């Protein structure tokens with residue numbers, strides 16, 4: 658058993674708060690925000706040795722990242738930003754920092770009761786996206 662056991666599985670989005678404003682702050686344009694706003698992605702998390710994989714599967718777009726904790730990687734986001742990402746575990750919370758064009762956003766993923774709560778922060782704007790097991 659190990660580092661991210663309680664994260665592993667298939668998760669479905671059940672609620673989203675303040676996501677449009679988070680997207681605005683990140684720079685997403687109108688049409689993408691509207692289509693992104695409707696999506697109910699599945700989040701699929703797996704671990705194989707030191708490598709963690711997080712897939713996002715939806716109607717719009719399927720994306721995937723694989724990474725080692727603390728080791729920077731290149732990532733193309735759902736809104737087509739080319740970012741440099743680093744994910745660490747801080748007190749049981751996955752902390753994902755994306756850097757691009759002198760900007761930064763932080764996405765925190767944590768287990769709370771039977772949910773996986775995703776908090777997305779850019780400058781003063783927070784969006785909370787709640788997932789349940791599928």
Ligand SMILES: Cc1sc(NC(=O)C2=C(C(=O)O)CCCC2)c(-c2nc(C3CC3)no2)c1C
Nearest residue numbers: 680685693696698715717718735736764777786
């Ligand atoms: C079909 C989907 S899902 C999704 N984003 C998520 O699902 C996101 C999260 C999650 O995994 O819940 C958590 C992190 C933030 C994003 C987008 C989308 N994000 C963006 C900008 C805000 C980054 N632009 O588009 C689309 C088109």
